[PDB]
């Protein structure tokens, strides 16, 4: 709801990968149609975090490793040479993909109890 | 629901035609059907047909049909409808009076009569 | 058990009734307002469920009930902006047309120079206006309601909607193929977000639309009860094409500050009656088909008969033909048909400008002329039809062809559909006894 | 096409006992009762419902395709010819008695 | 939010309870209350879990005894030869009275460890 | 002037039409960006960019 | 919305005591459910971010400072209900949360390189 | 004194024709324009 937490995530967006992580009328029915906007945007975010394990967790921890296809690349490039910027490009184009196999490995933790 | 008035009685020779009007103010006109009843001397209740309302559509039965039209005349507020019928020919067995009913939902049943309007031949 | 656990995600529903919203595929305004509606999905999901019967009726389906009631709003939504010819009801001195069916003549009205008068000449059909003792006319309907004329930008084109369930909510239908008006289907399929229906408008024989396959199907409340039309559903399309060979010419009237009236202006080329064609062969075989099909429904002979009449708008055959209202008769088709070439059936009919539909209290409305001829072609895929009967008839069961209310016409279209709840909640008995 | 049939054709019965009329029936069935040259009324549909304004003592019972109508201790002014009513067929009914 | 997941739910519907596991305008102002219907309901589902001590866990279990006055089946039967729509039919009357009594377990047991 | 083409309505008397400054303000989940580099025009690049809600 | 009802029960019980225990009508009406939506994900909007996110007693590794307040803790969940304790601490409400959100941050990140 | 009937003409069916009509109407409903005149 509240935008403050959004805009801090904002801060720093320049700055390296490894960086990121140490640092009735007009109004009244737009604001209407903003605030169920508003509000429907940050489910968005809790119902992907709910179903792949994350809850309440700023950073999460699965159990899927990397394809090859995706890229190939070590720990020391990625993290103190590029940004979330054009990183982010680079493995956009298998976001769908990924997301299809993330849901399944926490699926598939709940039933072995 | 307050009245369902008749015409009154009146007679006409064979081959002549023969009018009778149904008013209806009470109740809404628009969503509830209408029927017309017959009923001979020394004999049951007879069926002639139903108009509907809200398109002026008539259905009678075999032997009625050619010879009976059902019309309706809305006033000029939507209120006090008015339901006439009229038929052709005569014959020396058409001596009966007729009702005005309605019908009321699903269940074909029938709460408001008119007087009734005795025609002979 | 003697331990409780909790499911999330179970497949369970109950039957409810929530809103639905609009979804259209792929410059102009329309009457549906179309423009609002969310782009439909690319490919729409058609999850199937195997071992699941479900029952469920359309006649107390609350989908159609919504359709009716937003269709309505939106025409009221329409013509709300553009103007209403309120200033045109005076003593029309009409008497006769130099081209009994089209009228030439001119009305005294004034625009500005409040203590002055002026002419203006304006075509009207016979029977748009009525005599109101000799030579003198009166606008039909305004001693009812006020007559407004229809926006000249927006279009009668009829493309399809989808009416698409909110998320957490789930619409269940079944292809029983010979599937029942009213019972239960055991080939359910959850569909996430419905398909293309055309909101079409008639009163005899329904137009366009999808149809069935190796069936003819027929759909009614009761089949004993009189009152309750019968739905009659075709596997064949039988085309039905026709056009008004006239030439018309579009004029603008003024009749106030910004307010203008579009007249038929004057008419171009010689008169020819507007007529619709029908294939014969075509036609006669398609009724013996649906007769074989009422046959065993009812055990009697079955015998077609016209209309017994009514108001013009049931007791012909109407339909949009690119912003023209047609009103023809269908008599040719039911008369004296019982069923037990190159020749093509022709059906002469007349034309209506204004036109008093969606049946309500004081409340009417004007169609705009459009100039040249215009050119529709259409599929004949239902028969609404009224049963005449008394009983006690040696077969002889007549069968007469009617309308009916509006939403009669589109119980043909989404006979197969049901909006329900989801509740995702589960309990069930297991020996866990959390640690 | 559907059937009735009214099996007595003639009712007798004395003041304050119990009487009773069937009408073997499908369908929807509705009971009238009419006056010499007045207009029938509306005692029950359904079967079973009651109608306003009918007094009470009239109610009806359906079992399988009979219909059931119980008329107990008679007053004057319950004399009637009472009759079935299917949808679109009625049969003659009884004079009560007197 | 997305309604699809919901409708994922719903596969296998026939199946086992055992086998289930195993697998301006009126266009706009409905669409708003569908919004705003739509998101009710997502966040419905979730409050009563949240409260039960369950954070989205898919399968998740409690510490309450089932009382047999509600039901007394063998667990095989009712995972073998049930659905899991006739489940909802015979405990519908007494869904009320488990969802409470599970409320009353998740606030004893939260309780329990601060105490210790 | 208008009344072959239009239709004229009066302004509210009780209004005031006066300019007052206002504020086109984001709603939750999203930002604007602006930049202030000293000199630069519609178009291109800008390396100076700062986060206002 | 009954849940919220609930919380009344028992207010002016002492804390220790209690935790033992188109038109007119269509619009207004949709703002309140956007209203009442809102203001159920405020509350759990900033329990997330805390790490307690659903339990019904949370338990932080922030220290009381004797700044806020001073006063046994015998003296608190026995004599006062919860109605005096904010004003007591209303007016530096903001100070515990953002001193609070950072812990959940630091607490995170130790957890990480763990 | 304390109901008029009386007649008077409005708009009709067709705007150039006229229809003359009566009503009655209560006491303090109207007010007098003055001698047998009144107004809403
Ligand atoms: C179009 O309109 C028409 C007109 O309404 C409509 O016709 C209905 O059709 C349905 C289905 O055919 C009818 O419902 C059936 O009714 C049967 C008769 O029930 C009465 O009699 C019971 C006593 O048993 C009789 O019948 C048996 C068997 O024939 C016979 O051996 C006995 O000797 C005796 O004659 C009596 O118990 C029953 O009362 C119960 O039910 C009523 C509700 O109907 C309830 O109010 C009571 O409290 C009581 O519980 C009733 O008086 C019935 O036998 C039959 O049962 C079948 O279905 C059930 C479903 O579970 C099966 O379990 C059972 O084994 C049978 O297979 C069925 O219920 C209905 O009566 C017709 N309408 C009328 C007015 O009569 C059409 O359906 C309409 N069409 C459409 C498309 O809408
Ligand atoms: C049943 O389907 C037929 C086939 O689509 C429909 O006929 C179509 O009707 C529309 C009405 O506007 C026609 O649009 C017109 O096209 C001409 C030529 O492009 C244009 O000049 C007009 O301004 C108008 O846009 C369309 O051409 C026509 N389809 C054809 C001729 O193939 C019919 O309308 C459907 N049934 C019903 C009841 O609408
Ligand atoms: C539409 O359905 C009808 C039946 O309702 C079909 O008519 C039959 O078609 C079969 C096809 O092999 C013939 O053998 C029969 O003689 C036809 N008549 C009857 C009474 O069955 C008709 O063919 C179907 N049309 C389409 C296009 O599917
Ligand atoms: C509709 O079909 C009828 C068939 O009866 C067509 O009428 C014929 O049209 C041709 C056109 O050259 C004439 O030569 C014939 O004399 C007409 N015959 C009759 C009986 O009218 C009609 O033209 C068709 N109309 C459309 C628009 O297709
Ligand atoms: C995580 O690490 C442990 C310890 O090396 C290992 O046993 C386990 O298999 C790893 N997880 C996966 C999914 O491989
Ligand atoms: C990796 O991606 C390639 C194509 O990019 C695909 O053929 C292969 O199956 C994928 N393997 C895994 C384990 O995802
Ligand atoms: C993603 O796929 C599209 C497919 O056309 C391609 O053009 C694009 O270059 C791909 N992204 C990257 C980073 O290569
Ligand atoms: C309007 O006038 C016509 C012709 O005089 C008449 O038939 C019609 O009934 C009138 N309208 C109403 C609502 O009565
Ligand atoms: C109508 O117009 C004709 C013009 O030929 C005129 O002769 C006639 O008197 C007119 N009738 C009226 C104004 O009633
Ligand atoms: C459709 O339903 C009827 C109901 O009697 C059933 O007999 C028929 O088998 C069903 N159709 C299919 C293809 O199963
Ligand atoms: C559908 O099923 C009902 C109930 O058996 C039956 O009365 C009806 O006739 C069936 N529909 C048709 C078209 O026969
Ligand atoms: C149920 O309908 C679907 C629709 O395509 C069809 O594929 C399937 O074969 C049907 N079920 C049966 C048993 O025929
Ligand atoms: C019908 O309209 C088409 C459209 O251009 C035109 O070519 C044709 O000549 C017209 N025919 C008649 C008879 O008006
Ligand atoms: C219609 O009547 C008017 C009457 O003045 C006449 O001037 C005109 O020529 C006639 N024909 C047309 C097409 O308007
Ligand atoms: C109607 O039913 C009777 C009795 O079974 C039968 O003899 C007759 O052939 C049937 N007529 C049809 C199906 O047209
Ligand atoms: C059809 O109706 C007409 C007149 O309404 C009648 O003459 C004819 O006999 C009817 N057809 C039959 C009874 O087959
Ligand atoms: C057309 O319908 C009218 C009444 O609607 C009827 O009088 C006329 O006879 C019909 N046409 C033919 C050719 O029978
Ligand atoms: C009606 O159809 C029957 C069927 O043979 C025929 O004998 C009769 O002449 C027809 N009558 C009319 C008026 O078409
Ligand atoms: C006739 O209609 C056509 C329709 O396209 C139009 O182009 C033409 O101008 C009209 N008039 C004549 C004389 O053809
Ligand atoms: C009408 O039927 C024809 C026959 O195949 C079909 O091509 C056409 O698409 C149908 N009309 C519509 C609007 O789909
Ligand atoms: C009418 O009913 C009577 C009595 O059952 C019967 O004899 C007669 O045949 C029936 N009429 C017809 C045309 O069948
Ligand atoms: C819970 O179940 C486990 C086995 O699933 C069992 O060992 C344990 O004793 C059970 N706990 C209780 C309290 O019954
Ligand atoms: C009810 O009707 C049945 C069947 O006709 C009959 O046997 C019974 O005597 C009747 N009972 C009463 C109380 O009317
Ligand atoms: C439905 O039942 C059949 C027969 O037991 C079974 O083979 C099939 O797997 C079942 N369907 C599902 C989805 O389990
Ligand atoms: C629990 O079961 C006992 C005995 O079976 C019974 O007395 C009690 O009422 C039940 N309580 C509930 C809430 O079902
Ligand atoms: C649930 O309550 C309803 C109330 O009408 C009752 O009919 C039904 O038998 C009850 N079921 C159970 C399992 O208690
Ligand atoms: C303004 O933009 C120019 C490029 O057009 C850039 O060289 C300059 O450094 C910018 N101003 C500041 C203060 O950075
Ligand atoms: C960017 O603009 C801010 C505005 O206050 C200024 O303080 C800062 O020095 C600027 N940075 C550059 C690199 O121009
Ligand atoms: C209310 O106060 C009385 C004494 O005045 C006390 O006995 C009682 O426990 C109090 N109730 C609550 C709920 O605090
Ligand atoms: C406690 O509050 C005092 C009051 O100013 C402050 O000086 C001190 O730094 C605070 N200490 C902590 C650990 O918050
Ligand atoms: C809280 O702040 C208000 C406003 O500054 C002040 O009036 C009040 O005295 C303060 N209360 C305490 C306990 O500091
Ligand atoms: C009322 O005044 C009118 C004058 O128009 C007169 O005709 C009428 O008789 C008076 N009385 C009543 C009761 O209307």
């Known amino acids: 709801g509240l935008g403050a937490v959004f805009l801090g995530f904002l801060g720093a967006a320049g700055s390296t990968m490894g960086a990121a992580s140490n640092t009735l009328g007009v109004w009244g029915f737009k604001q209407l149609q903003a605030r169920v906007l508003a509000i429907e945007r940050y489910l968005e975010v809790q119902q992907l975090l709910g179903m792949w394990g994350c809850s309440g967790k700023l950073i999460c921890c699965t159990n899927v490793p990397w394809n090859s296809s995706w890229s190939n690349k070590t720990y020391n490039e990625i993290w103190d040479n590029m940004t979330w910027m054009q990183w982010d490009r680079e493995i956009g184009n298998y976001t769908d993909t990924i997301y299809k196999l993330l849901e399944v490995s926490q699926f598939q933790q709940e039933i072995n109890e | 629901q307050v009245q369902l008035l008749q015409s009154g009685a009146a007679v006409t020779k064979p081959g002549a035609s023969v009018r009778v009007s149904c008013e209806a103010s009470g109740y809404n006109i628009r969503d509830y059907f209408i029927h017309w009843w017959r009923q001979a001397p020394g004999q049951g209740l007879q069926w002639v047909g139903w108009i509907n309302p809200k398109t002026g559509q008539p259905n009678n039965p075999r032997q009625f049909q050619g010879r009976v039209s059902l019309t309706r005349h809305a006033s000029w507020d939507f209120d006090t409808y008015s339901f006439y019928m009229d038929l052709k020919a005569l014959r020396s067995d058409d001596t009966a009076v007729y009702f005005c009913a309605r019908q009321r939902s699903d269940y074909w049943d029938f709460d408001v009569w008119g007087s009734g309007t005795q025609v002979t031949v | ?435 | 096409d559907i059937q009735m049939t009214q099996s007595p054709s003639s009712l007798s019965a004395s003041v304050g006992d119990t009487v009773t009329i069937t009408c073997q029936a499908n369908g929807y069935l509705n009971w009238y009762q009419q006056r010499r040259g007045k207009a029938p009324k509306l005692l029950i549909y359904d079967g079973s419902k009651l109608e306003r304004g009918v007094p009470s003592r009239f109610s009806g019972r359906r079992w399988g395709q009979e219909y059931n109508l119980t008329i107990n201790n008679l007053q004057p002014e319950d004399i009637a010819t009472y009759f079935c009513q299917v949808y679109e067929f009625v049969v003659p009914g009884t004079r009560l008695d007197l």
């Open chain 3, 1 to 435: 058990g003697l331990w409780v656990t909790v499911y999330y995600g179970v497949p369970v529903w109950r039957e409810a009734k929530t809103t639905l919203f609009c979804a259209s595929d792929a410059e102009v305004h329309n009457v549906w307002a179309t423009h609002a509606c969310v782009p439909t999905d690319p490919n729409p999901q058609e999850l199937v469920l195997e071992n699941v019967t479900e029952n469920f009726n359309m006649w107390k389906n609350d989908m159609v009930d919504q359709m009716h009631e937003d269709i309505i709003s939106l025409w009221d939504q329409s013509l709300k902006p553009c103007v209403k010819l309120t200033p045109l009801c005076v003593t029309l001195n009409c008497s006769d047309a130099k081209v009994e069916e089209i009228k030439n003549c001119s009305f005294k009205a004034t625009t500005e120079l409040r203590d002055k008068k002026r002419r203006e000449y304006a075509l009207f059909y016979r029977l748009d206006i009525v005599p109101l003792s000799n030579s003198e006319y009166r606008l039909i309907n305004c001693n009812t309601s006020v007559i407004t004329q229809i926006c000249p930008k927006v279009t009668f084109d009829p493309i399809p909607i989808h009416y698409c369930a909110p998320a957490g909510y789930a619409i269940l239908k079944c292809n029983n193929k010979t599937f029942n008006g009213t019972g239960p289907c055991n080939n359910v399929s959850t569909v996430q977000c419905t398909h293309g229906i055309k909101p079409v408008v008639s009163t005899q024989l329904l137009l366009n639309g999808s149809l069935a396959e190796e069936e003819i199907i027929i759909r009614s409340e009761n089949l004993t009860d009189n009152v309750k039309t019968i739905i009659v559903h075709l596997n064949e399309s039988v085309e039905i094409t026709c056009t008004r060979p006239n030439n018309m010419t579009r004029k603008s009237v003024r009749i106030g500050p910004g307010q203008t009236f579009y007249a038929l202006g004057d008419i171009i080329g010689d008169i020819r009656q507007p007529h619709c064609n029908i294939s014969e062969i075509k036609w006669e075989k398609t009724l013996q088909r649906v007769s074989e099909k009422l046959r065993e429904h009812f055990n009697k002979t079955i015998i077609f008969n016209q209309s017994s009449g009514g108001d013009l708008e049931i007791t012909t055959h109407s339909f949009n033909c690119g912003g023209e209202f047609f009103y023809c008769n269908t008599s040719d088709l039911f008369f004296n048909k019982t069923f037990n070439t190159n020749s093509t059936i022709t059906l002469p009919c007349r034309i209506k400008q204004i036109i008093n539909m969606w049946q309500e209290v004081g409340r009417a409305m004007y169609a705009p002329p459009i100039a040249g001829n215009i050119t529709c072609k259409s599929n004949i895929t239902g028969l609404l039809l009224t049963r005449d009967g008394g009983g006690n008839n040696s077969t002889k069961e007549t069968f007469r062809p009617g309308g009916g209310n509006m939403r009669d016409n589109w119980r043909s279209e989404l006979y197969k559909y049901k909006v329900v709840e989801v509740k995702p909640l589960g309990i069930a008995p297991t020996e866990c006894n959390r640690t």
